[PDB]
Write an enzyme that holds these catalytic residues in place. Structure first.
Site, short mmCIF file in Angstrom:
data_model
loop_
_atom_site.label_atom_id
_atom_site.label_comp_id
_atom_site.label_asym_id
_atom_site.label_seq_id
_atom_site.Cartn_x
_atom_site.Cartn_y
_atom_site.Cartn_z
N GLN B 37 36.21 -23.03 56.19
CA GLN B 37 36.71 -22.07 56.83
C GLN B 37 36.69 -21.19 56.86
OE1 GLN B 37 40.33 -23.68 54.75
NE2 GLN B 37 41.46 -23.81 56.85
N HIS B 54 31.63 -33.40 64.13
CA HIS B 54 30.25 -33.31 64.35
C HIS B 54 30.61 -34.47 65.64
CE1 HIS B 54 29.25 -28.91 63.56
NE2 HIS B 54 28.40 -29.03 64.41
N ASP B 68 30.97 -24.04 62.19
CA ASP B 68 29.73 -23.77 62.13
C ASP B 68 29.43 -22.05 61.84
OD1 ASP B 68 28.49 -26.37 62.88
OD2 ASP B 68 27.70 -25.85 65.15
N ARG B 93 42.17 -16.22 46.46
CA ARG B 93 41.46 -17.84 45.53
C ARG B 93 40.11 -17.92 46.67
NH1 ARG B 93 44.30 -22.36 47.28
NH2 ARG B 93 42.41 -24.41 46.72
N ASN B 184 41.10 -28.70 45.98
CA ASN B 184 41.88 -28.66 46.67
C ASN B 184 43.54 -30.21 47.07
OD1 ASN B 184 43.48 -26.51 48.37
ND2 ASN B 184 42.59 -28.10 50.15
N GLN B 185 44.45 -29.38 47.45
CA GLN B 185 45.50 -30.70 47.66
C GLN B 185 45.24 -32.26 47.18
OE1 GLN B 185 47.22 -27.86 50.67
NE2 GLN B 185 46.35 -29.79 51.57
N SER B 188 45.51 -34.66 50.03
CA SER B 188 45.15 -34.44 51.75
C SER B 188 43.84 -35.46 51.62
CB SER B 188 44.74 -33.16 51.78
OG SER B 188 45.79 -32.37 51.97
N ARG B 257 55.58 -29.63 48.90
CA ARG B 257 56.60 -30.13 49.31
C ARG B 257 57.87 -30.40 48.62
NH1 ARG B 257 53.87 -34.29 54.23
NH2 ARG B 257 52.26 -33.09 54.32
N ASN B 326 50.17 -24.87 46.12
CA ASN B 326 50.19 -24.97 47.54
C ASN B 326 51.91 -25.54 47.86
OD1 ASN B 326 47.58 -23.87 47.45
ND2 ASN B 326 46.94 -25.82 48.80
N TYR B 328 53.54 -25.21 51.59
CA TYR B 328 54.32 -24.41 52.91
C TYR B 328 55.54 -25.11 53.11
CZ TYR B 328 49.57 -23.57 53.41
OH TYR B 328 47.86 -23.16 53.44
N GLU B 407 48.28 -21.38 47.46
CA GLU B 407 48.50 -21.38 48.87
C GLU B 407 50.31 -21.27 49.43
OE1 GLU B 407 46.79 -23.62 51.54
OE2 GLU B 407 44.46 -23.88 50.32
N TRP B 455 48.46 -17.64 51.67
CA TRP B 455 47.04 -18.49 52.64
C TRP B 455 47.66 -17.64 54.17
CZ3 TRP B 455 42.81 -21.17 51.61
CH2 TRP B 455 42.35 -21.68 53.16
N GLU B 462 40.88 -23.72 61.03
CA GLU B 462 41.40 -24.46 60.87
C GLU B 462 41.62 -25.61 60.79
OE1 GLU B 462 44.34 -24.47 58.75
OE2 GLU B 462 45.59 -25.65 59.40
N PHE B 463 41.54 -26.09 59.49
CA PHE B 463 41.62 -28.29 59.79
C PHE B 463 42.05 -28.65 60.82
CE2 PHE B 463 40.07 -26.92 55.34
CZ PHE B 463 38.77 -27.51 54.79
#
Ligand SMILES: *[C@@H]1O[C@H](CO)[C@@H](O[C@@H]2O[C@H](CO)[C@@H](O[C@@H]3O[C@H](CO[C@H]4O[C@H](CO)[C@@H](O)[C@H](O)[C@@H]4O)[C@@H](O)[C@H](O[C@H]4O[C@H](CO)[C@@H](O)[C@H](O)[C@@H]4O)[C@@H]3O[C@@H]3OC[C@@H](O)[C@H](O)[C@H]3O)[C@H](O)[C@H]2NC(C)=O)[C@H](O[C@@H]2O[C@@H](C)[C@@H](O)[C@@H](O)[C@@H]2O)[C@H]1NC(C)=O
Ligand SMILES: *[C@@H]1O[C@H](CO)[C@@H](O[C@@H]2O[C@H](CO)[C@@H](O[C@@H]3O[C@H](CO[C@H]4O[C@H](CO)[C@@H](O)[C@H](O)[C@@H]4O)[C@@H](O)[C@H](O[C@H]4O[C@H](CO)[C@@H](O)[C@H](O)[C@@H]4O)[C@@H]3O[C@@H]3OC[C@@H](O)[C@H](O)[C@H]3O)[C@H](O)[C@H]2NC(C)=O)[C@H](O[C@@H]2O[C@@H](C)[C@@H](O)[C@@H](O)[C@@H]2O)[C@H]1NC(C)=O
Ligand SMILES: *[C@@H]1O[C@H](CO)[C@@H](O[C@@H]2O[C@H](CO)[C@@H](O[C@@H]3O[C@H](CO)[C@@H](O)[C@H](O)[C@@H]3O[C@@H]3OC[C@@H](O)[C@H](O)[C@H]3O)[C@H](O)[C@H]2NC(C)=O)[C@H](O[C@@H]2O[C@@H](C)[C@@H](O)[C@@H](O)[C@@H]2O)[C@H]1NC(C)=O
Ligand SMILES: *[C@@H]1O[C@H](CO)[C@@H](O[C@@H]2O[C@H](CO)[C@@H](O[C@@H]3O[C@H](CO)[C@@H](O)[C@H](O)[C@@H]3O[C@@H]3OC[C@@H](O)[C@H](O)[C@H]3O)[C@H](O)[C@H]2NC(C)=O)[C@H](O[C@@H]2O[C@@H](C)[C@@H](O)[C@@H](O)[C@@H]2O)[C@H]1NC(C)=O
Ligand SMILES: *[C@@H]1O[C@H](CO)[C@@H](O[C@@H]2O[C@H](CO)[C@@H](O)[C@H](O)[C@H]2NC(C)=O)[C@H](O)[C@H]1NC(C)=O
Ligand SMILES: *[C@@H]1O[C@H](CO)[C@@H](O[C@@H]2O[C@H](CO)[C@@H](O)[C@H](O)[C@H]2NC(C)=O)[C@H](O)[C@H]1NC(C)=O
Ligand SMILES: *[C@@H]1O[C@H](CO)[C@@H](O[C@@H]2O[C@H](CO)[C@@H](O)[C@H](O)[C@H]2NC(C)=O)[C@H](O)[C@H]1NC(C)=O
Ligand SMILES: *[C@@H]1O[C@H](CO)[C@@H](O[C@@H]2O[C@H](CO)[C@@H](O)[C@H](O)[C@H]2NC(C)=O)[C@H](O)[C@H]1NC(C)=O
Ligand SMILES: *[C@@H]1O[C@H](CO)[C@@H](O)[C@H](O)[C@H]1NC(C)=O
Ligand SMILES: *[C@@H]1O[C@H](CO)[C@@H](O)[C@H](O)[C@H]1NC(C)=O
Ligand SMILES: *[C@@H]1O[C@H](CO)[C@@H](O)[C@H](O)[C@H]1NC(C)=O
Ligand SMILES: *[C@@H]1O[C@H](CO)[C@@H](O)[C@H](O)[C@H]1NC(C)=O
Ligand SMILES: *[C@@H]1O[C@H](CO)[C@@H](O)[C@H](O)[C@H]1NC(C)=O
Ligand SMILES: *[C@@H]1O[C@H](CO)[C@@H](O)[C@H](O)[C@H]1NC(C)=O
Ligand SMILES: *[C@@H]1O[C@H](CO)[C@@H](O)[C@H](O)[C@H]1NC(C)=O
Ligand SMILES: *[C@@H]1O[C@H](CO)[C@@H](O)[C@H](O)[C@H]1NC(C)=O
Ligand SMILES: *[C@H]1O[C@H](CO)[C@@H](O)[C@H](O)[C@H]1NC(C)=O
Ligand SMILES: *[C@H]1O[C@H](CO)[C@@H](O)[C@H](O)[C@H]1NC(C)=O
Ligand SMILES: [Zn+2]
Lengths: 499, 499
Positions: B37, B54, B68, B93, B184-185, B188, B257, B326, B328, B407, B455, B462-463
């Site tokens: 990111q 891509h 990129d 982090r 990470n997570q 996901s 969550r 994390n 949110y 996060e 975060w 952002e993904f």
């Protein structure tokens, strides 16, 4: 008696004087492109030109441009066919992106059926419009996975992976494609990709360029060239033994240049000039016609030059039905030391020649070909007679091959605005002055040239230059890439083809 | 007695009422980021987030943006340290891009010494400024070569490659980095990367999304989750057995969550809510605390749920020193059918729950979290008390772990202009309302939370969203990415940390 101009001003833009009728009836006229340069990454896997341009953005071009979206021929392939249709072109050279049809590199890992469809639709559409496809299997865009598994053409593993890839192309497209190119410009990847690291994958000796991630400029260009020749020869053998029913032809692509002595009364410069022909052309044409490297290469390169086994020699020798000869320019050659012990030694120093566009008595060889900002002395100049000297040399030295000129063209600055870009008279002059000599050498020397494909169909990402130069006969607006509009050169070429 | 707000308007932005002093002396406060990111592709190999964005640009974000160049923390890592320095942050982090230090994926293929230096300079600079690094080994950016060799975490080969990569990080950085995150997570990649194909690598069943190149949404999320847990557990074992001298700690990252019943007097909705806790949290926490999946997963998922051997169970059970949680938002859960036979079945349907932000009697759970253009009914809303319920649940259900909130943050639209983006009061409200509850749960429930990392440090790619949303506490102008300027939220956070 055909007379062609070598110096500005040219007058061959007049289709009364020069047109397709000057050539045999069946002679193919068209344009060329390559996948990385036109398609965009949508719908395909990643390859080393994505890798290289993203890892080394200052080597992708001064604007850091790359092939991520470029002219989006993935979406707009029909517009490419419309340009060819407007030209009344009879040939179109394009390349298949290995990453689009086998994103995972090795065929046993699965094929991208949608990528196979993309090329089916394109090939059909060309054929519907009477355009003969000339399809390059490998125009440098090696799936990144293969470069990361075993460093691509550095390793003999590339031979079977390239064979399985070629086999899938022949099986899927060979019913409609009758002219195959194996590897684009054999000389380029070994030297620029593994010697100077200007090109993907960007390997070189540490003191040649500290940014290279690995390499050896002195040895790897020979290893890579050797694997290219073997991979090419294995594909041609597969083609001729397993797809002879398709009634097509296959050949490599050479980048050709002519070489003249920097001083034509100096025996050392004359010697350097003949060494260049062997090291630049013979490095590949000697194996392709004889199964062996040139003796001067054997002698100079010594233990750094791989040997072919008898079986390998036999596979490589004669491994073409025709040669795709790309031609852009000619250089003067003068002697240069070959410091084989210097840590910055490159394979390219082995020829023992220094190349220029100005000879000893200050004569520039021809009109401007490419301007350089960072160094006016590093400008390239072209030499229309070079195409005559190259073709004549190939017929004489390399056994009278069947040739198609698979690229020939010139850039104009990306700085120019739209109206200046469209008024590309310098491109008409470059194309016609070469077409004049090409007709001249076919008639005078009886070279078996059967087609000509100008580079490029449209503006695209140019390797090393991003979007800072334009090579297209049709203009592409980088703010909206849908249209391809015939420039003055494309309109001239249309008239040249259908006078 | 601590009282925290659940609904607008919040008043926790007043550092008189809430600040770092409210927490224990040693509590770490900072921000977080990830390599894909922020860094850019310069200087590294390619990974599946390059691949995915891509190949499937419309899945990279609505603007087709990607990582990129993004905020170019490759060039500007010192500016990231300057933001942390300005915040008086005590923690940062960030993630190591596997592709930057082992571009060829497998360590035996060689390491990128310049990539290793990049992270050395960063880690030093953080330490020089009194900032504790929390380093994520794997924030989703799997070298593309591994995905192409064996489809990455789909294959048990990922376990040794991930181990060798982690070993290089510990050996190179573990003298200065004392807090490691493995993956990470956890939830996901299995679900979004192999179930819905919203995320790299973008695998799913053919009728779930025809653009996926391969996959099976019903089985692969379980295979990938299983290999994640084994790869994570092998790395933690390597860390604790071979790098115990470094005196550091390692843990996984969970996306957490909370879940509330869509109808809290309906036993089916209550059941769906408890199933969600098991399927979302327990899928990983059950193996991490017990070496086994939750029973409801065993029962529902049946033959599609892999088993751990005794050795594997033992490796995975207890495989953390702390948990990076994390957090949110929270969802309401109601029953949903699990059509295991439908060709469009996904692993996510196995929970038998439908998730919303509005409960049966029309109550929205909290303030707006993210707006959706294509569907106002698909807006996300947040729920500050969710962080209290999550932490309390982890202490109670999962053996009183040591936790760092790795996060927590909220986006603001990328449409907003600079002055509106800077005036990000909605972000102060989100952060402080969660920090209030976090302090509240540490004091009331005695949860062992020892730090909080918002975060994100700055705006970044952002993904899934490209640059269409901004998450940074510091603003980055995409026309000139050098500066990171503290927004109102970053200035508030600075005062919160040093009141
Ligand atoms: C087209 O391909 C032809 C081959 O199919 C080329 O002809 C070959 O050219 C070779 C030279 O490049 C030549 O090989 C040399 O043969 C010498 C004599 O061999 C015999 O005698 C030895 C002692 O009596 C004995 O050891 C052997 O067992 C043989 O019986 C030999 O001394 C040479 O080796 C020395 O020099 C080479 C460098 O060239 C070194 O590699 C080596 O260390 C040693 O210093 C040389 O032998 C070759 O050595 C390397 C090894 O891998 C090879 O297998 C071995 O052959 C060979 O005899 C001929 N073959 C034939 C059938 O003619 C032809 O080359 C051109 O024409 C030849 C006549 C010559 O003028 C070349 O310089 C030209 O390039 C190729 N044509 C073109 C246009 O390239
Ligand atoms: C924390 O980890 C603990 C393990 O270390 C969990 O406890 C295990 O829970 C297992 C159920 O998930 C339980 O296994 C079952 O054992 C049954 C009886 O086994 C014996 O008797 C059989 C006949 O006499 C004989 O065949 C065997 O040889 C044994 O001697 C067995 O019938 C069950 O199998 C059926 O059901 C399972 C689905 O759960 C199917 O997979 C299977 O096809 C069959 O239909 C089951 O056996 C397990 O089957 C799958 C196989 O891979 C396993 O190796 C095999 O064990 C097991 O006995 C206990 N172990 C112990 C030491 O208690 C614990 O689970 C929680 O607590 C248990 C008591 C129970 O309430 C679970 O539902 C809870 O989830 C884990 N805790 C948490 C919080 O997850
Ligand atoms: C293209 O190459 C030719 C052949 O090499 C160049 O001509 C040669 O140029 C040499 C000077 O660069 C001439 O040598 C000199 O001879 C004089 C008189 O004896 C002497 O004073 C010099 O020191 C030098 O002598 C050499 O010194 C080194 C020794 O190893 C060598 O053996 C000596 O000869 C040389 O005679 C001449 N050769 C011929 C056959 O003409 C030619 O150079 C251009 O023409 C010559 C005539 C002269 O005007 C040069 O200055 C002039 O550049 C070169 N052409 C160009 C355009 O570079
Ligand atoms: C949160 O969930 C609760 C529990 O499910 C909801 O209350 C239930 O709502 C049902 C209607 O959705 C009630 O059933 C009806 O009962 C009447 C009178 O006997 C009958 O005319 C209906 O056909 C229906 O009967 C059911 O039909 C299907 C059978 O399989 C079932 O066994 C029958 O009972 C049900 O009595 C009621 N349960 C309780 C314990 O209150 C609740 O729904 C909200 O409250 C109820 C009182 C009613 O006003 C609903 O319209 C209202 O939505 C739900 N809350 C919300 C906000 O959705
Ligand atoms: C490139 O590879 C060649 C060959 O592996 C290296 O040259 C060798 O150097 C060693 C040590 O100086 C010598 O013992 C050999 O005789 C050399 N071999 C030949 C064929 O020249 C060369 O040093 C490498 N270059 C770099 C820059 O790595
Ligand atoms: C540099 O190139 C020029 C142009 O090709 C050469 O000049 C020609 O030389 C021959 C005789 O040597 C003459 O017949 C031509 O009239 C010359 N052409 C021009 C345009 O002057 C020149 O000889 C080359 N110089 C060297 C040192 O090789
Ligand atoms: C995903 O994989 C599963 C299992 O390989 C497939 O489900 C199997 O389907 C076959 C044929 O219908 C049955 O014989 C098996 O009983 C099923 N296995 C289980 C575990 O459900 C499923 O069809 C695949 N899905 C797709 C979309 O490819
Ligand atoms: C939907 O959420 C609302 C808000 O959390 C719930 O309403 C609360 O209900 C309890 C008793 O059932 C009361 O003590 C509160 O005063 C209510 N709060 C508000 C703001 O009205 C509601 O019960 C939930 N609905 C369902 C069906 O679960
Ligand atoms: C094409 O060029 C030739 C000379 O090569 C000329 O005689 C002929 O008339 C030209 N054709 C047309 C249609 O202009
Ligand atoms: C031709 O095809 C057959 C069948 O796959 C293959 O096994 C054979 O070796 C091929 N011939 C080549 C590659 O020259
Ligand atoms: C892009 O080009 C096409 C073809 O010329 C045109 O019709 C379309 O409206 C253009 N869009 C913009 C945004 O310029
Ligand atoms: C295309 O070329 C053919 C062959 O020379 C010619 O007969 C035909 O008229 C040309 N069509 C156009 C539109 O120029
Ligand atoms: C920080 O907040 C506390 C309440 O948690 C308050 O008593 C204290 O005075 C505040 N500190 C400052 C410096 O504002
Ligand atoms: C620790 O390091 C040694 C030395 O490389 C290795 O062979 C051993 O198996 C490692 N232990 C692990 C990976 O748990
Ligand atoms: C980019 O930002 C830096 C830091 O603010 C500034 O000093 C530099 O001149 C800027 N360049 C442009 C082109 O805006
Ligand atoms: C940074 O935080 C420390 C610890 O609370 C404090 O003593 C110091 O004054 C702070 N510095 C600034 C500039 O806020
Ligand atoms: C090696 O080559 C470069 C470029 O040709 C040159 O500038 C440099 O002087 C060379 N170094 C040595 C030690 O020969
Ligand atoms: C499968 O799922 C999609 C989304 O949940 C739904 O719209 C569709 O009706 C389903 N198809 C079948 C045949 O169940
Ligand atoms: Zn890109």
């Amino acid at each position: 008696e055909i007379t062609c101009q070598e110096n500005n001003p040219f007058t061959c833009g007049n289709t009364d004087g020069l047109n397709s009728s000057s050539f045999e009836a069946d002679f193919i006229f068209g344009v060329a492109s390559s996948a990385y340069q036109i398609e965009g990454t949508i719908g395909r896997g990643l390859n080393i030109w994505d890798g290289f341009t993203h890892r080394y953005p200052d080597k992708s071009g001064p604007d850091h441009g790359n092939g991520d979206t470029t002219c989006d021929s993935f979406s707009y392939w029909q517009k490419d066919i419309d340009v060819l249709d407007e030209l009344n072109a009879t040939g179109y050279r394009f390349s298949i992106a290995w990453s689009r049809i086998i994103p995972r590199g090795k065929r046993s890992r699965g094929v991208n059926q949608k990528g196979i469809d993309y090329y089916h639709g394109l090939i059909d559409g060309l054929i519907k419009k009477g355009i003969t496809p000339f399809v390059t299997l490998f125009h440098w865009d090696l799936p990144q996975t293969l470069q990361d598994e075993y460093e691509g053409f550095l390793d003999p593993q590339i031979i079977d992976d390239f064979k399985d890839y070629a086999d899938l192309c022949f099986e899927e497209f060979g019913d409609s494609v009758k002219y195959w190119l194996t590897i684009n410009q054999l000389y380029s990847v070994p030297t620029r990709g593994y010697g100077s690291a200007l090109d993907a994958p960007g390997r070189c000796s540490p003191t040649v360029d500290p940014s290279c991630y690995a390499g050896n400029s002195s040895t790897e260009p020979y290893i890579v060239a050797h694997h290219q020749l073997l991979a090419h020869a294995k594909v041609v053998d597969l083609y001729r033994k397993n797809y002879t029913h398709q009634g097509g032809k296959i050949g490599p692509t050479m980048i050709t240049r002519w070489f003249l002595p920097y001083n034509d009364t100096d025996r050392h410069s004359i010697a350097a000039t003949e060494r260049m022909k062997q090291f630049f052309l013979g490095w590949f044409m000697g194996p392709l016609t004889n199964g062996t490297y040139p003796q001067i290469m054997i002698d100079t390169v010594g233990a750094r030059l791989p040997t072919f086994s008898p079986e390998e020699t036999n596979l490589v020798k004669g491994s073409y039905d025709f040669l795709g000869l790309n031609y852009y320019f000619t250089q003067y050659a003068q002697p240069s030391p070959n410091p084989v012990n210097a840590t910055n030694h490159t394979a390219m120093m082995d020829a023992g020649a220094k190349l220029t566009y100005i000879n000893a008595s200050g004569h520039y060889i021809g009109p401007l070909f490419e301007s350089d900002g960072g160094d006016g002395s590093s400008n390239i100049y072209y030499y229309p007679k070079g195409i005559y000297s190259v073709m004549d040399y190939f017929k004489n030295k390399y056994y009278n091959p069947l040739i198609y000129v698979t690229e020939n063209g010139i850039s104009t600055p990306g700085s120019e605005n739209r109206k200046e870009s469209m008024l590309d008279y310098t491109r008409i002059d470059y194309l016609c002055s070469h077409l004049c000599f090409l007709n001249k050498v076919i008639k005078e020397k009886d070279v078996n040239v059967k087609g000509y494909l100008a580079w490029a169909l449209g503006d695209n990402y140019e390797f090393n230059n991003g979007f800072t130069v334009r090579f297209g006969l049709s203009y592409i607006n980088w703010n909206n890439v849908t249209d391809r509009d015939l420039k003055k050169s494309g309109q001239w070429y249309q008239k040249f083809i259908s006078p």
